[PDB]
């Protein structure tokens, strides 16, 4: 597979996830992987139909991110995500509200879209 086609499919998966989040209503590759790991950890705490589906989609998207990273001759292992009681942080000045979480995730994906168009670092 060409790396061009990997980039195309990553952008397409991002657009799919963004439109799915619509229907319900960072910079380098490492920071993107970390953001998606954190969002996976969040989504696992509020499991519904669409939330489980979005978390699985994010797993695939992270796999594609790592395909790109390895095509750029640079390693960035599976980001752990959080340091870890979820409920407290999530309820207060955080996420928890399923809509708020999905909106923050939509914004992060939309930023990743532009950043991937810019051939970002690793």
């Amino acid at each position, epitope marked *: 597979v060409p790396i061009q086609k990997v980039q195309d499919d990553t952008k397409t998966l991002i657009k799919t996830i963004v439109t799915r989040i619509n229907d319900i209503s960072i910079l380098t590759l490492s920071k993107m992987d970390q953001t998606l790991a954190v969002y996976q950890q969040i989504l696992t705490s509020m499991p519904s139909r669409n939330v489980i589906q979005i978390s699985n989609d994010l797993e695939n998207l992270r*796999d594609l991110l790592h395909v790109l990273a390895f095509s750029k001759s640079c390693h960035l292992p599976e980001a752990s995500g959080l340091e870890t009681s979820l409920g407290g942080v999530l309820e207060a000045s955080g996420y928890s509200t399923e809509v708020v979480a999905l909106s923050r995730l939509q914004g992060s994906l939309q930023d990743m879209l532009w950043q991937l168009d810019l051939s970002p670092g690793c």
Partner: antibody
Amino acid sequence: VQLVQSGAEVKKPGSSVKVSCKASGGTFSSYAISWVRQAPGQGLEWMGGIIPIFGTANYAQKFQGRVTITADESTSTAYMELSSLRSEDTAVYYCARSQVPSSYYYGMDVWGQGTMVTVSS
Amino acid sequence: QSVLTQPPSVSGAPGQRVTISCTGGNSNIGAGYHVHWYQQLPGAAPKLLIYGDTNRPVPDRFSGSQSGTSASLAITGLQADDEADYYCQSYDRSRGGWFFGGGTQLTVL
């Protein structure tokens, strides 16, 4: 690249079996290794997978609780252990390396020869 | 019961075009995720024919297409060597797993 598997095995109900999948010239840890079974006259059944460098495995809901997928990056060998063997498990078990590095998004391009495991009293 | 559905058998005479289908729901073939096609000859391990709906690793006689919640594999100019089992694979997002189809035994008459 080639994936070489252990030899066939005959086991009895209740016992367990462990099938191996060694590499023959590849960055075994960077890729993904899937385990797929096929009973006689039935089709392929995705049992699970694992990316060795990351260490975390994924299992089909059907085989969850009875299958364990592990990987040894040193020997570049994956292992699939099935416990509490039943008559229905009689089948050929394949291991398959994905086409691109760490993802099944683009298929599995390097399959193994298959290991026949027969469960009968 | 496999998530992906295929015809149990299709048959054609040499030189004929054959089409094998692979239908599912919006959680697998629909919603972006692709459909791979694997060929398994009598007494052999599966081989990757098609990945990502259409791409080939494979003679140009094999081809793939995807529409809605269906995908299809076309074998033009059927040969004696194409007689084999054909499995479609796709990612189910409700079950979280790259699950295969029931498979289609392609016979050359």
